[model samples]
Target: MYHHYHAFQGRKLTDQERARVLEFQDSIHYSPRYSDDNYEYRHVMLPKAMLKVIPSDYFNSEVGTLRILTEDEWRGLGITQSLGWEHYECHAAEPHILLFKRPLN
Candidate 1:
């Protein structure tokens, strides 16, 4: 492992924080407009646009989103896995680079 988690750190989370976090997540509802189009989908559109540069052979129907990160970033870090673009570590290779992928919107 790289020189990671050897520096300063913050306090750990507690059960109270967990419940509060869940409440916040529950509040974050996917509000869909019944009339106008959603401009907030810019992120999804951005990913779709990024997909244009990727080769079809590299991505297929299963790959809905693609993300790239570096080793430290992946550890933070980042990708080399083939399981639906799961961030992987390929030692002796370009371990510094990583990619993460997910399915669905």
Candidate 2:
């Protein structure tokens, strides 16, 4: 039997985007892990969704949600003062989508 997991990231998804995710979620497939491994590898479904900017990393089975605030949004949040210009690269790359991981267990 396949134990399942789910991940949804991004701020307020569009109606169509959310719909595609559900469609893909239902059809997601996975590969078996090794004896000592704790991670299950998702197959085709994820990449298909990624064609439109789906995201993930070598995260533990914990569900991951990413909030990518653009220049306008983060500035409003006062993240700019917290991290000076030099710090921007650390959180975000050039012409970047700022990276901050928000965890909900």
Candidate 3:
């Protein structure tokens, strides 16, 4: 069996969201795997949902949600930062998506 996870809500995402998600995924995908580092892989199964932008409760309200593995929590998801060209190249080179069927157990 396999586990699942998700991220908090954010501004309604557009094509920009898909691009960003893939860009981020690609960057981490080809990143050098460190022995001491425990890298967690995440799949963007759903596109970014750009909910109506609120004025006051922006900070408290949910924007968008992301799903991934539990281990990813500690490793840090780099969604907030702007992905540099170099980072994008590395990620795009080797984009991998792992899949597993759920077990009855």
Worst 10 residues of 1 by lDDT: 39-48
Q: Rank the candidates by lDDT, best first.
A: 2, 1, 3
Question: Where does candidate 2 have its weakest 10-residue lDDT segment?
Answer: 82-91
Computed on alpha carbons, the lDDT of every model, listed in order, comes to: 0.29, 0.32, 0.28
Give the winner by lDDT. Answer: 2
Tally clashing residue pairs in candidate 1: 6
Q: 3-65, model 2: which lDDT tens digit per residue?
A: 988443224445664454455443333333222243222111133333343323212123232
RMSD of 2: 15.6
* Local lDDT at 68 for model 3: 26
Tens digit of per-residue lDDT, candidate 1, span 1-105: 677555422232245533433333322222222222322210111222233433333222343333333333222211112222224333332321222334432
lDDT of 3 by residue, 24-59 (tens): 443432322222233322322221222222122222
Top candidate on TM-score is 2
Q: Which residue pairs show collisions in model 1?
A: 73-77, 74-77, 74-78, 79-98, 79-99, 80-88
Query: At residue 24, what lDDT does model 3 achieve?
Result: 45
